[PDB]
């Protein structure tokens, strides 16, 4: 018995100077057959936290489910205080690291604002290891996205959203698993904002 599947797709996180962005396609896939065209691959966990676990969906949904439960327990124990991005990062590491010899096959990313207000993005190795990064992408077409962005970034939250649109539009052009719909979550001190855009159907 093989306990691990695959669902394809891609996610992208960008740590703006002040704002933070997390984007991913909505398409769910199994061996060349489109399972569905709109599955939300990016989630909002509150406290200006947006989370996304790419790869095996059943591993990803569990990780976000447990993390969300941990946030609720954190609120109860800490007088409903907000959960910092750094605190969440280490919390997720323990969740990921708690199953080493039977780990999640998910390259998850959490985006938000660190204490001082700057954009924050943390990418987690499937065995837990994380590092603060300005921008990061993971999944099937990740290799097709980062090189394009690095040219144009290495910027507001309306001109990066242009590049992400073109970046995913380029990936969907040459990559078959890239989805037929783009989800973008924008984190600012104002709050979290969800934007959706359409991509190629085939």
């Amino acid at each position: 018995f093989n306990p691990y599947g695959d669902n394809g797709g891609t996610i992208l996180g960008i740590a703006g100077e002040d704002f933070a962005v997390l984007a991913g396609d909505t398409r769910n896939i199994t061996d060349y057959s489109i399972n569905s065209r709109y599955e939300p691959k990016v989630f909002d966990c509150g406290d200006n936290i947006v989370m996304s676990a790419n790869g095996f969906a059943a591993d990803g949904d569990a990780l976000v489910k447990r993390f969300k439960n941990s946030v609720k327990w954190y609120h109860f124990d800490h007088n409903d205080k907000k959960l910092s991005i750094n605190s969440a990062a280490r919390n997720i590491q323990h969740l990921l690291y708690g199953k080493r010899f039977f780990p999640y096959y998910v390259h998850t990313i959490i985006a938000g604002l660190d204490e001082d207000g700057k954009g924050a993005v943390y990418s987690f190795d499937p065995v837990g290891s994380y590092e603060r990064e300005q921008c990061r992408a993971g999944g099937a077409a990740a290799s097709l996205i980062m090189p394009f962005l690095d040219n144009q970034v290495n910027l507001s939250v309306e001109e990066v959203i242009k590049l992400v649109r073109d970046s995913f539009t380029s990936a969907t052009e040459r990559h078959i698993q890239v989805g037929d719909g783009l989800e973008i979550l924008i984190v600012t001190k104002d709050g979290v904002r969800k934007e959706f855009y359409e991509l190629k159907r085939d």
Binding site: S33, N35, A58
Partner: peptide, 30 residues
């Protein structure tokens, strides 16, 4: 495997390749 997804049309096994394309022609989107 615990993999879950929603769709306007759903089919399992052999029906995912035969019926799902046909049903999708009726309801391609929300």
């Amino acid at each position: 495997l615990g993999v879950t997804y929603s769709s306007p049309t759903l089919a399992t096994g052999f029906g995912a390749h035969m019926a799902n394309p046909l049903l999708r022609k009726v309801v391609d989107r929300e």
